[PDB]
Design a protein around this motif. Structure first.
Motif, short mmCIF file in Angstrom:
data_model
loop_
_atom_site.label_atom_id
_atom_site.label_comp_id
_atom_site.label_asym_id
_atom_site.label_seq_id
_atom_site.Cartn_x
_atom_site.Cartn_y
_atom_site.Cartn_z
N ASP A 11 0.82 -1.21 0.00
CA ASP A 11 0.00 0.00 0.00
C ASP A 11 0.85 1.27 0.00
O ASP A 11 1.07 1.87 1.05
CB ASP A 11 -1.02 -0.03 1.14
CG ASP A 11 -2.04 -1.13 0.98
OD1 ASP A 11 -2.40 -1.46 -0.17
OD2 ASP A 11 -2.45 -1.69 2.01
N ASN A 45 -3.95 -4.42 3.21
CA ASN A 45 -5.20 -3.70 3.42
C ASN A 45 -5.42 -2.66 2.32
O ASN A 45 -4.72 -2.66 1.30
CB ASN A 45 -5.31 -3.15 4.86
CG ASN A 45 -4.21 -2.12 5.27
OD1 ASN A 45 -3.29 -1.75 4.53
ND2 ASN A 45 -4.35 -1.64 6.49
N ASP A 96 0.11 0.61 7.86
CA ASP A 96 0.81 -0.63 7.52
C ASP A 96 2.24 -0.63 8.06
O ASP A 96 3.17 -1.05 7.37
CB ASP A 96 0.79 -0.84 6.01
CG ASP A 96 1.54 0.24 5.24
OD1 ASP A 96 1.98 1.23 5.86
OD2 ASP A 96 1.70 0.07 4.02
N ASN A 116 0.92 -5.01 5.73
CA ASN A 116 -0.33 -5.72 5.54
C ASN A 116 -0.93 -5.45 4.16
O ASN A 116 -0.66 -4.42 3.54
CB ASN A 116 -1.33 -5.33 6.63
CG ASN A 116 -1.61 -3.83 6.67
OD1 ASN A 116 -1.21 -3.07 5.79
ND2 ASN A 116 -2.28 -3.38 7.73
CA LIG Z 1 -0.94 -1.56 3.83
#
Ligand SMILES: [Ca+2]
Ligand SMILES: *[C@@H]1O[C@H](CO)[C@@H](O)[C@H](O)[C@H]1NC(C)=O
Ligand SMILES: *[C@@H]1O[C@H](CO)[C@@H](O)[C@H](O)[C@H]1NC(C)=O
Ligand SMILES: *[C@@H]1O[C@H](CO)[C@@H](O)[C@H](O)[C@H]1NC(C)=O
Ligand SMILES: *[C@@H]1O[C@H](CO)[C@@H](O)[C@H](O)[C@H]1NC(C)=O
Ligand SMILES: *[C@@H]1O[C@H](CO)[C@@H](O)[C@H](O)[C@H]1NC(C)=O
Ligand SMILES: *[C@@H]1O[C@H](CO)[C@@H](O)[C@H](O)[C@H]1NC(C)=O
Ligand SMILES: [Ca+2]
Ligand SMILES: [Ca+2]
Ligand SMILES: [Ca+2]
Ligand SMILES: [Ca+2]
Lengths: 323, 388, 478, 98
Positions: free
Chosen positions: A18, A137, A143, A135
């Protein structure tokens, strides 16, 4: 989407799943990705001294591969040949660049000729894999969730939480590098500011902006244009990442390396195409079609004819046989 | 133990004696002291020789006198490395309602603190004695029915004599012999799930009770899976052949693989778990010689020398000041120096020529003639020669 | 700043009293009986002296719960552990003191579970004393034995032999069936119930045995003895570390030397002290195979067992799963794996937790061969998850002392008004039973026992073979 | 030995027609490699591959017992609270049906 992407491009730089970059000059092994509740696998990356060496995949408890730019892949400690396909892990070479597929276990790794680790990973681990690529997400600020689970403001101590040591070597907290750029400033910031800038000015990059933002990419380059002496090519690593990051989002770009004055390294006979099919029709090949409906991938490949035969491009007339 | 003995012989367990008569060892049933133990990351031992694990992070009770209130011990646990399955001991607190209702605190070094005040060792108050053991580990001793051991890097011990038979309550159990009831919460019932027992003895409500005690943290660190095998495979190797017939090694192996994979540096985690086994092999009678340049031989300073089984009675210079005092101590292991040399305060050890005196606490130099109006005193070679 | 809520008060460290047991010693329900540390209070707000904190609610009274399995229990709420109830009469449950029925086991080929509960390892090959009563200074009523053959390395081999010696009898079993070699005097207490997989086997008021037809031996005792026995299963005293009291009356530490004391033939082979290691013969230096067995042994921690994982620790029954199937070369019969989980499932059932873990790709256990003799296919037989072991039959119409609640296995089920007989594999109406009711009183289906040995004058005998309404004459002594 | 079920009393009709020496060498090749633990399917499947070929030549065989590759069918007669039990595992029934 249904996928992800991490990248460790150039020297010490990182790109999580991300849109969150930083720098890290590690010293030993570190966990790239893998489960956090339960690990069926674990992708691992070894740093010698800041600079990177190896990608490693430990598949639970029993199996281990230790690929790297050296390409002399090994299984445990016994050096094996290449390619290699044990335990559901095809260890191949695509577009002159090395690949490690785990589609059963839901990941695809690879490396380029220069050395730029990349990790494609399914949507199955959304809100799962917590590690050094963060992560999977939607958010990009949260993150950094440490091995304890702690939102941290520093992109540095975080990466040091996710260290992992061996009996062959136990490793410590690495130090941030003391930048020599701070004194040798001179002209290097006035003339070379443009190569970071052309991500924003040139039309070929002037259209991923509704999909991404170059503001971090230009932010991370300006600190690395200062250590290398006498070269515009120091910008193309941070730039080369921005090409792929927009490509993964469903919007590819074309021919940008024509005028950029930097092409990524490849062995003889090939140079960097963009969006070549992975199913490279080679010499000792069966003429079959419409099975390779896979997505289109970047990497260097042969000329129009000049079929592949054992890591080189050779003309179609001279196709050998085998016995 | 798979070997024969003639009749009339009398072998002795640590607990009591037994004698062979008509192919039937006769034995006594007299009680013998228990030993709760904390070590490694989170590995406990009850008084009733149970083993278990509970990686909670709060201030937990460890032991307590529960029909009267002669004492009470309180451990304090913290995460201790990057992993979540690594919860070592930081500090333990001790409390004596019989003396000021004071509050002793063993700290993460070899230090101690009474009511906030740091203290030099020794600390002879009326009942409790606190002194170093090898000059690297504290040893409390209240009365004659209580001992302790160092809580610096977390190897807390206890020694309770049978006067406390069955009349304590805590994580370490009842001290009643029965190995099964030890998961009895303060609410008076035996719990099967350990994750309910440990969190039932926490002291602060804000602390998070856990839900699962993991058994294989080597999954979260697959790199150490190999090394944790060959490393503590020496535990069963015949180096320890002598005390397979003294104490069960299988847990002391089980508690290695949970530590070497979990902790920040597996070097000393390894070599603080093997010693956990040898220390219990020696507590029954079997000493083992398991030190090598590879298998973690400690580095005694240049003044001292490594030693296997020695006498910590004729070592310190304080001994010559108070020679009359009894030293009913065992044959311990550590860093000593040859008999001609005795220990000085400043890390070196010295002959008894410049061994000072500790008269009334006062550290007098080797030649200090010394007198009020009415007495006459001097320090010769370690002993304080007073007259009148 | 924040003016804290009405029911509790802001406190302040005094400058004189070192014992500022304020905010740091925040008394909740867990810590009340416990003792707490405190250097000095803080600028917090704190419940009154006769009141505490409870999940962000300063609960008024000392009625807060009495936690078991990390779960709430209001005061007066009850629980059932084993055969006992127990209620938190205040903050502390006080439990009853009716000691429960203990249970040996032989999990897999070479392991043993004692009464007090102690898994240990003993690969033997001679004949061994599982348990007996003739121990030191007692009469010596029963002398259960066990005998294994080719079982030091678990494999498809290791057929057991069990010889049990009670009331001067000799009944023994192996190769699927039981065999009587010498009938015992008091045939009255004798009883055999071939229900499902098992052979339940009573022998008295305070004894019972179970056998899964393949390896498992699970003898069950009552409150009567309480330290009257010894053998492999130990002494049955509640104390768990004194289950290694060898025949020469001392505690050992290495159980391989323990069982060597208890063998019968004192000139056969004592087993060999194996070098300990987490990998048996095949799994040794075959790390690959170890992880396919490791994973497949994690069915003992699966979604379906989550109820029983809370009560019965699976870490014992797990280590056996990995020990046997490494050694065992399962080829055609995967029984050296399938049998270890049933040995866990049954123990889960005894605590009232039925489980259905057995599917078609995994240890199927059909029951269809029985609904075969009859040309008509009524198929009343079924593999019922855990059905009662003590039911009613033409052979055993009465309700029996039932040491086992339920059992896996193949069980009959037809509509009511039809009761089972084993000789004719189908169920059948009540009247078709060879039942006996002579001179009115309700009893068994014509047991072969000579009633009334006490009184000669009152010797009014009435046998019944199958149905006969008959009464024999007693032979006078004169 | 356990692969000599392919030469057993029940297969004696099919041993005459279809040579078992091919299907035997596979039985010994797989189960050596295969680490059968919970599912003994890398053994049970090789004989069915011989039994089916015996059936195609008109020789039905019932070689499958309870200690040996059971193949229950009872989970299907389960959804219905009533237990009609109309499903059965039997020898060799018409592969084709309506
Ligand atoms: Ca992330
Ligand atoms: C790199 O590959 C070469 C050639 O196989 C080998 O000699 C060398 O030891 C390898 N070095 C590393 C870092 O593995
Ligand atoms: C992600 O996982 C966390 C921790 O289990 C949970 O609190 C959160 O609700 C999850 N979020 C999503 C989007 O699933
Ligand atoms: C438990 O305690 C209650 C309340 O004192 C008492 O009424 C009851 O008899 C006790 N039961 C047992 C089993 O001790
Ligand atoms: C069979 O098991 C089912 C499901 O547990 C239960 O409902 C039924 O009563 C059982 N029947 C018999 C005959 O045991
Ligand atoms: C019942 O017992 C009598 C002996 O008194 C015997 O003659 C008769 O055959 C028996 N009947 C049956 C049905 O067993
Ligand atoms: C088995 O199937 C065969 C062929 O369909 C049939 O002829 C036979 O009656 C069946 N036997 C049984 C016991 O069901
Ligand atoms: Ca106890
Ligand atoms: Ca016992
Ligand atoms: Ca019930
Ligand atoms: Ca035909």
């Amino acid at each position: 989407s249904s996928t992800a992407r991490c990248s460790l491009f150039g020297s010490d730089f990182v790109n999580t799943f991300d849109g969150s970059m930083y720098s890290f000059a590690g010293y030993c092994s570190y966990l790239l990705a893998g489960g956090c509740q339960k690990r069926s696998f674990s992708i691992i990356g070894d740093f010698q001294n800041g600079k990177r060496v190896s990608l490693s995949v430990y598949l639970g408890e029993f199996f281990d591969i230790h690929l790297f730019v050296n390409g002399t892949v090994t299984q445990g400690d016994q050096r094996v040949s290449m390619p290699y396909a044990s335990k559901g892990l095809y260890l191949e070479t695509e577009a002159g660049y090395y690949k490690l597929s785990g589609e059963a276990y839901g990941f695809v790794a690879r490396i380029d000729g220069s050395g730029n680790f990349q990790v494609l990973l399914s949507d199955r681990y959304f809100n799962k894999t917590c590690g050094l690529c963060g992560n999977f997400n939607i958010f990009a600020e949260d993150d950094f969730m440490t091995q304890e689970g702690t939102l941290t403001s520093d992109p540095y101590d975080f990466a040091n939480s996710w260290a992992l040591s061996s009996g062959e070597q136990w490793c410590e907290r690495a130090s941030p590098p003391s930048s020599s750029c701070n004194i040798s400033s001179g002209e290097m910031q006035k003339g070379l500011w443009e190569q970071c800038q052309l991500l924003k000015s040139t039309s070929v990059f002037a259209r991923c902006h509704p999909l991404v933002d170059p503001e971090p990419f230009v932010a991370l380059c300006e600190k690395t244009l200062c250590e290398c002496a006498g070269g515009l090519e120091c910008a193309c690593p941070a730039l080369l990442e921005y090409a792929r990051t927009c490509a993964q989002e469903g919007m590819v770009l074309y021919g940008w390396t024509d005028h950029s004055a930097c092409s990524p390294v490849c062995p003889a006979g090939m140079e960097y195409r963009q969006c070549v099919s992975p199913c490279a029709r080679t010499c000792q090949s069966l003429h079959i079609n419409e099975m390779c409906q896979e997505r289109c991938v970047d990497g260097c490949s042969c000329p129009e004819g000049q079929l592949l035969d054992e890591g080189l491009c050779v003309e179609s007339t001279e196709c050998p046989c085998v016995h | 133990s798979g070997k024969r003995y003639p009749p009339g012989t009398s072998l002795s367990r640590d607990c009591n004696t037994c004698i062979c008569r008509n192919s039937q060892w006769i034995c006594s049933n007299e009680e013998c002291p228990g030993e709760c133990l904390v070590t490694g990351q989170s590995h406990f031992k009850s008084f009733d020789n149970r083993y278990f694990t509970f990686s909670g992070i709060c201030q937990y009770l460890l032991a307590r006198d529960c029909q009267d209130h002669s004492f009470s011990i309180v451990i304090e646990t913290v995460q201790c490395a990057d992993d979540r399955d690594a919860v070592c001991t930081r500090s333990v607190t001790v409390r004596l309602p019989g003396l000021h209702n004071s509050l002793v605190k063993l700290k993460h070094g070899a230090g101690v603190a009474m009511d906030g005040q740091d203290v030099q060792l020794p600390l002879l108050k009326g009942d409790l004695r606190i002194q170093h053991t090898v000059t690297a580990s504290v040893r409390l001793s209240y009365g004659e029915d209580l001992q302790m051991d160092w809580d610096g890097r977390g190897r807390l011990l206890v020694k309770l004599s049978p006067v406390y038979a069955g009349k304590t309550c805590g994580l370490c159990g009842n001290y009643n012999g029965n190995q099964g009831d030890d998961f009895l919460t303060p609410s008076g019932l035996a719990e099967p799930r350990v994750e309910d027992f440990g969190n039932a003895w926490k002291l602060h409500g804000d602390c998070q009770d856990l839900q699962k005690q993991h058994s294989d943290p080597c999954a979260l660190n697959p790199r150490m899976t190999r090394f944790s095998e060959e490393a503590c495979a020496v535990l069963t190797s015949p180096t320890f052949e002598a005390c397979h017939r003294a104490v069960s090694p299988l847990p002391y192996l089980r508690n290695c693989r949970y530590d070497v994979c979990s902790c920040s540096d597996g070097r000393e985690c390894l070599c603080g778990a093997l010693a956990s086994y040898a220390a219990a092999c020696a507590g029954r009678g079997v000493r083992v010689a398991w030190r090598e340049p590879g298998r973690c031989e400690l580095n005694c300073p240049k003044g001292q020398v490594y030693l296997q089984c020695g006498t910590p009675c004729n070592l310190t210079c304080r001994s010559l000041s108070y020679p009359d005092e009894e030293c009913n101590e065992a044959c311990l292991e550590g860093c000593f120096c040859p008999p001609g040399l005795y220990m000085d305060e400043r890390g070196d050890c010295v002959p008894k020529a410049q061994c000072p005196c500790y008269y009334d606490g006062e550290i007098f130099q080797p030649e200090d003639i010394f007198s009020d109006h009415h007495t006459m005193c001097y320090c010769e070679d370690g002993f304080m020669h007073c007259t009148m | 700043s924040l003016s804290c809520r009405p029911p509790m008060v802001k406190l302040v460290c005094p400058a004189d009293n070192l014992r500022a047991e304020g905010l740091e010693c925040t008394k909740t329900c867990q810590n009340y009986d416990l003792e707490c540390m405190s250097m000095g209070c803080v600028s917090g707000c704190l419940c009154p002296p006769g009141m505490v904190r409870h999940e962000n609610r300063c609960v008024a009274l000392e009625r807060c719960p009495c936690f078991h399995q990390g779960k709430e229990y209001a005061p007066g709420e009850t629980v059932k552990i084993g055969c006992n109830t127990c209620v938190c009469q205040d903050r502390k449950w006080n439990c009853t003191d009716h000691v429960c029925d203990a249970t040996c086991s032989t999990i897999g080929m070479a392991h043993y579970l004692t009464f007090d509960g102690l898994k240990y390892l003993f690969p033997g090959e001679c004949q061994y004393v599982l348990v007996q009563d003739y121990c030191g200074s007692n009469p010596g009523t029963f002398r259960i034995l066990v005998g294994n053959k080719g079982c030091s390395h678990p494999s498809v081999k290791c057929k057991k032999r069990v010889t049990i010696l009670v009331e001067g009898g000799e009944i023994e079993l192996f190769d699927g069936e039981v065999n009587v070699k010498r009938p015992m005097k008091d045939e009255t207490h004798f009883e055999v119930v071939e229900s499902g997989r098992y052979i339940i086997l009573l022998l008295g008021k305070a004894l019972s045995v179970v056998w899964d037809r393949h390896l498992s031996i699970s003898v069950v005792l009552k409150q009567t003895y309480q330290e009257k026995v010894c053998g492999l299963c130990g002494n049955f005293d509640g104390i768990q570390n004194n289950d290694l009291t060898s025949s020469n009356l001392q505690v050992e530490e290495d159980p391989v030397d323990f069982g060597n004391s208890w063998k019968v033939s004192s000139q056969c082979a004592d087993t060999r002290k194996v070098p300990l290691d987490s990998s048996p013969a095949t799994c040794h230096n075959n790390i690959m195979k170890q992880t396919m067995v490791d994973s497949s042994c994690r069915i003992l921690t699966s979604d379906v067992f989550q109820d029983c994982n809370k009560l019965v620790d699976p870490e014992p029954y797990l280590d056996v799963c990995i020990y046997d199937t490494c050694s065992c070369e399962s080829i055609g019969d995967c029984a050296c794996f399938c049998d270890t989980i049933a040995a866990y499932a049954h123990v889960c059932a005894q605590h009232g937790k039925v489980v259905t873990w057995r599917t078609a790709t995994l240890c199927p256990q059909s029951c269809e061969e029985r609904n075969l003799m009859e040309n008509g296919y009524e198929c009343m037989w079924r593999y019922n998850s855990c059905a009662p072991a003590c039911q009613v039959t033409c052979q055993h119409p009465e309700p029996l002392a039932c040491p086992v609640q339920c059992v896996e296995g193949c069980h009959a089920h037809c509509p009511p008004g039809k009761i089972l007989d084993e000789l004719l594999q189908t169920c059948v109406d009540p009247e078709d039973c060879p039942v006996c009711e002579v001179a009115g009183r309700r009893f068994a289906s014509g047991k072969k026992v000579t009633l009334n040995p006490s009184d000669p004058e009152h010797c009014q005998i009435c046998h019944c073979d199958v149905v006969n309404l008959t009464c024999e004459a007693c032979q006078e002594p004169g």
